[PDB]
Write an enzyme that holds these catalytic residues in place. Structure first.
Site: not given
Ligand SMILES: CC(C)(C)c1ccc(CC[C@H]2CC[C@@H](O)[C@@H]3[C@H](O)[C@H](O)CN23)cc1
Ligand SMILES: [Zn+2]
Length: 1016
Positions: A61, A312, A442
């Site tokens: 991703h 990712d 997004h």
């Molecule tokens: C645990 C920690 C470090 C707070 C965390 C929490 C969630 C994520 C992933 C977030 C998701 C959903 C929101 C979005 O903004 C992001 C970006 O587009 C990325 O591709 C991963 N996505 C990545 C890391």
């Molecule tokens: Zn994303």
């Protein structure tokens, strides 16, 4: 012929509004599958004659901006992912990989040498590397306009057809924060057969999984027959990462992510690491993995199972390709040779999964349910509803809609001619399309990127606006100058654009004053463009250096005009008041422009020594205690003063509006006889919770219902004119303006939240309309969907995207609010509408962004407010999930999104000037739009080709006689037509060769594309 989109309620297996009404949304601990249940299966289900076929689909991703910019991620990560994918897939013929983001792929492929370009084409042609969706980005589905979802899809697929020779028919959307039916709508009309989605409410995943309804035929909410249906796969678990994709137990699945053993700096939070597969452990490891797979398979109807393998920015390191591939190959060799499992597992692509599913369907193994509705508002856990990003970074959300229109106008104005390569038209238009397409990501329009990344998207969009202006003004010069006089320098500025609403008054001092004077220049030509395919009148305004100016058309016919002062609002840090100052040097002139369908109209502004016969001057009244003088130079009318009071205004035959002593609307009277209907504007504030989870860029977690903004005794300015009147008031954080031109008012808010941390500012309308728990909001500017307020869900769950409009109604009365920018909103009580203006948040909300939202800047929000009687309208039945606008509301939306464009001639004299272009263009029925006009060929092509996207909305029948309009045949808009074809919406495949070279008009709620070919 055409389906009736109003009177026949579709019969579907799952209708999301009805599902919402029945569901309890309890958040119970389901065990290892925290939001599900302990899945059971019969080990005897699969056997020698009925095996489980498993496709493990490697993926990576790649966000085009989020925590780093597009270019930073390309350099640090994505170029290495793609370079190593090429090497590893080349060297390992059974390995597979899918790719979504064409912005990155194009950036990489153009930098490759020819040897490697050929290698890359070979792994695509042989099926190892497969493109999924093939858009420039994986767009947001909440805030994006459908026109820009189509634009970015077309940008990526056109690139793929040209360089790769493929057009994806399967879509992959694993990260947008909730999902819109606008996606299957566009995809199904662009050749697609299948799509996949992930981020839907955890309670929805549980409900659908229990019924094996996670694969469905997704049709539009008004579609009775089902011709819009697109097969859709919803993934069942909390994330697209490896722990949430092998099965229900992430403690187990994490052990099958072979990047998590330590040397890559990754680990398993469930405290059990992966271990290298060996001959001594493969039977026990296979036992555990196959058990996960058979549990996942219980949630679906066929014997074909999809197992995504990725996360990712994965597959970066050579060592990572090896550790994942070699361990999975050992598992497959064991599993596939052990008859007792009755499994055949392999690496696969997304298309291979869907092809096998449909082979099973055709064998009679499964039938799939039908579904309509949307998947907003998303929650990933507990009460954490992702409604904050409907508003976050609202400056850039508004900029999106401005650039949307400028791209359309530049493509259309320049489409009329073929251009020499030296004019750089194609170059500038490609840049503009690509920057706007990038922002649909997004983390772009959503307002969920880091501050420096938001700055990068803004800079890219400014460059795109400058590209559009260049193309537009070169086109106007060519369309309106006598051909034997036309003498272009393709680098010169013949016209400058004038835009009254972007960046807007009080945001940027960007507009040029037309400088006239007896001793310098007596007159100035201006030109208006109308991108819509019907004759249009609209008031237009320009800044001029004298109040004594009159307007003529290019037959020298006088045009009635109004002059008003130029007012600017200031936060006076001395007196501690917010109050307006009038210019002593510049003035506004306003007049009605009348412009042909998809055409141009020229007018002339001339100075005189004294008041012109056909120009009037507005009166001005400043209401405040403790006034001081307001001089206006040559302006012939003195400013008047008074203590705050209630006031009433009427322009033309239009409605009469009443205002409170604080300058806010309190009632609308539609006609002379009619009642004064209570319609009250109020500003309020939400705060943030002092304990537990905090609001941030994604999440809206209010500390209770909003509290009124304390207004004090604000300064109110009333301007009364024959053509335009207005009431403006300086409130804390907002200069609020109501403008009247003889129809539904225009509302403008200059919003500066300043240093108010942990505050969200909302604008509410209070009425006595008996709406109950029902309201309507739009999806991507394409359709209006019925919402029901649910008191069983928290306040933030009842917030929805307002990408272009919202309304409430009862048996007799409707109130519609149209917007010029996407924002979040709701109806939290009967008779109310509300829409968020901006939000400033000091804390991070733990979704990976690692910052709050503390980079706010002044933004000018625009709206139209339409109060109507609806007792005579033919409306859908109570059970229909859609609603539809009236003619007046639809035209009000078009006034916000696609206004007239205004051009000021830059030099002293325009030699060879002409008065009009497009007077012979057909004036189409009001519900039809030419959404896109684009020349598809460069000047060297013997056969020129022009593409058109035609959209027909559906407007309510309310008893207004339909007048005669002309049939619009887009294929005969340019001369010498030799062929007309109906195509997919991306223009990439011909679907029908059209009789007589005539392009038929489309049905209500349908969108078609046509390409005309011309002998050159
Ligand atoms: C645990 C920690 C470090 C707070 C965390 C929490 C969630 C994520 C992933 C977030 C998701 C959903 C929101 C979005 O903004 C992001 C970006 O587009 C990325 O591709 C991963 N996505 C990545 C890391
Ligand atoms: Zn994303």
């Amino acid at each position: 012929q055409c389906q009736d989109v109003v009177q026949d309620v579709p019969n579907v297996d799952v209708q999301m509004l009805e599902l919402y009404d029945r569901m309890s949304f309890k958040d119970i601990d389901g065990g290892v599958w925290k939001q599900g249940w302990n899945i059971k299966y019969d080990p005897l289900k699969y056997n020698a004659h009925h095996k489980l076929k498993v496709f493990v689909v490697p993926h990576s991703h790649n966000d085009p901006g989020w925590i780093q910019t597009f270019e930073e991620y390309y350099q640090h990560d994505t170029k290495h992912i793609l370079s190593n994918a090429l090497r590893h897939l080349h060297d390992n013929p059974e390995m597979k990989f899918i790719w979504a983001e064409i912005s990155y792929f194009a950036r990489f492929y153009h930098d490759l040498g020819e040897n490697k370009k050929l290698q890359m084409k070979s792994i695509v042609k042989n099926g190892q590397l497969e493109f999924v969706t093939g858009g420039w980005v994986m767009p947001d589905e909440a805030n994006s306009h459908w026109r820009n979802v189509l634009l970015q899809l077309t940008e990526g697929q056109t690139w793929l057809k040209q360089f790769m020779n493929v057009t994806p028919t399967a879509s992959w959307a694993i990260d947008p924060f909730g999902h819109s039916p606008t996606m299957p709508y566009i995809l199904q009309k662009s050749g697609f057969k299948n799509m996949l989605i992930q981020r839907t409410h955890y309670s929805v995943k549980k409900e659908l999984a229990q019924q094996r309804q996670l694969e469905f035929l997704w049709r539009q909410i008004w579609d009775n027959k089902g011709d819009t249906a697109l097969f859709t796969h919803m993934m069942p678990f909390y994330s697209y990462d490896i722990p949430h994709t092998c099965g229900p137990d992430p403690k187990v699945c994490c052990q099958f992510d072979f990047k998590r053993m330590g040397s890559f700096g990754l680990s398993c939070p469930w405290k059990v690491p992966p271990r290298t597969i060996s001959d001594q452990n493969v039977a026990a490891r296979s036992d555990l993995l196959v058990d996960q797979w058979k549990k996942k398979a219980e949630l679906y109807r066929t014997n074909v199972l999809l197992i995504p393998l990725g996360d990712d920015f994965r597959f970066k390191q050579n060592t990572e390709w090896d550790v994942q591939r070699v361990n999975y190959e050992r598992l497959f060799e064991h599993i596939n040779s052990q008859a007792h499992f009755n499994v055949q597992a392999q690496f696969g692509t997304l298309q291979e999964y869907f092809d096998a599913v449909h082979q099973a369907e055709r064998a009679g193994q499964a039938e799939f349910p039908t579904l309509s509705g949307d998947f907003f508002t998303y929650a990933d856990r507990s009460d954490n509803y992702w409604s904050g990003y409907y508003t976050s970074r609202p400056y850039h959300k508004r900029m999106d809609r401005v650039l949307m229109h400028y791209v359309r106008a530049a493509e259309m104005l320049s489409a009329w001619h073929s251009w020499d390569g030296m004019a750089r038209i194609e170059e500038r238009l490609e840049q503009a399309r690509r920057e706007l397409s990038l922002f649909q990501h997004h983390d772009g329009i959503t307002g969920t990127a880091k501050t420096h990344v938001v700055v990068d998207y803004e800079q890219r969009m400014q460059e795109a606006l400058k590209a559009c202006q260049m193309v537009m003004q070169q086109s106007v010069y060519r369309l309106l100058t006598k051909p034997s006089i036309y003498s272009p320098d393709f680098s010169f500025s013949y016209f400058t654009l004038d835009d009254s609403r972007w960046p807007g008054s009080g945001v940027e001092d960007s507009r040029t004053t037309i400088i006239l004077g007896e001793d310098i220049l007596p007159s100035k030509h201006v030109v208006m463009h109308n991108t819509l395919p019907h004759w249009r009148e609209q008031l237009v305004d320009f800044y001029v250096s004298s109040p004594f100016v009159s307007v003529t058309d290019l037959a020298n016919n006088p045009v009635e005009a109004q002059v008003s002062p130029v007012w600017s609002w200031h936060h006076d840090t001395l007196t501690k008041t917010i109050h307006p100052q009038g210019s002593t040097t510049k003035y506004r002139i306003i007049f009605k422009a009348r412009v042909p369908p998809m055409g141009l109209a020229t007018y002339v502004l001339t100075i005189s020594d004294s008041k012109p016969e056909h120009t009037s001057y507005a009166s001005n009244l400043l209401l405040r205690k403790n006034p001081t003088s307001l001089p206006l130079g040559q302006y012939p009318e003195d400013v008047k003063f008074g203590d705050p009071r209630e006031i009433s205004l009427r322009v033309g035959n239009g409605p009469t509006l009443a205002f409170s002593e604080q300058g806010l609307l309190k009632s609308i009277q539609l006609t002379q006889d009619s009642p004064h209907v209570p319609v009250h504007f109020k500003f309020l504030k939400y705060g943030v919770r002092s304990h537990g989870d905090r609001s941030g860029a994604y999440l809206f977690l209010p500390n209770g219902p909003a509290s009124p903004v304390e207004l004090g005794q604000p300064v109110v300015l009333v301007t009364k004119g024959k053509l335009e009147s207005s009431v403006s008031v300086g409130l804390p954080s907002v200069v609020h303006q109501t403008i009247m031109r003889g129809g539904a008012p225009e509302i403008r808010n200059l919003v500066d939240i300043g240093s108010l941390d942990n505050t969200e500012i909302v604008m509410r309308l209070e009425t006595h309309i008996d709406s109950g728990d029902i309201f309507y909001t739009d999806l991507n500017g394409l359709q209006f969907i019925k919402r029901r307020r649910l008191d069983k869900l928290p306040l933030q769950a009842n917030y929805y995207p307002i990408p272009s409009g919202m309304f409430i109604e009862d048996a007799n009365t409707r109130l519609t609010l149209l917007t010029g920018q996407p924002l979040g909103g709701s109806s939290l009580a009967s008779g109310e509408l509300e829409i968020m203006q901006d939000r400033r948040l000091a804390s991070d909300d733990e979704r990976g962004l690692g910052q709050g939202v503390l980079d706010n800047k002044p933004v000018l929000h625009i709206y139209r407010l339409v109060l109507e009687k609806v007792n005579n309208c033919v409306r859908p039945s109570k059970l229909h999930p859609a609603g539809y606008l009236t003619s007046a509301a639809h035209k009000a939306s078009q006034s916000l999104l696609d206004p007239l464009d205004k051009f000021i001639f830059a030099e002293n004299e325009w030699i060879g000037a002409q008065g009009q272009f497009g007077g012979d263009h057909p004036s189409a029925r009001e519900d039809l739009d030419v959404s896109v006009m684009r020349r598809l060929t460069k000047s060297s092509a013997k056969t020129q080709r022009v593409g058109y996207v035609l959209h027909r909305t559906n407007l309510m029948q309310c008893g207004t006689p339909e007048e005669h309009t002309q049939k619009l045949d887009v294929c005969h808009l340019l001369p010498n037509v030799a062929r007309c074809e109906r195509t997919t919406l991306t223009f990439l495949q011909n679907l029908e060769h059209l009789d007589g070279m005539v392009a038929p008009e489309v049905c209500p709620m349908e969108t078609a594309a046509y390409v005309s070919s011309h002998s050159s």
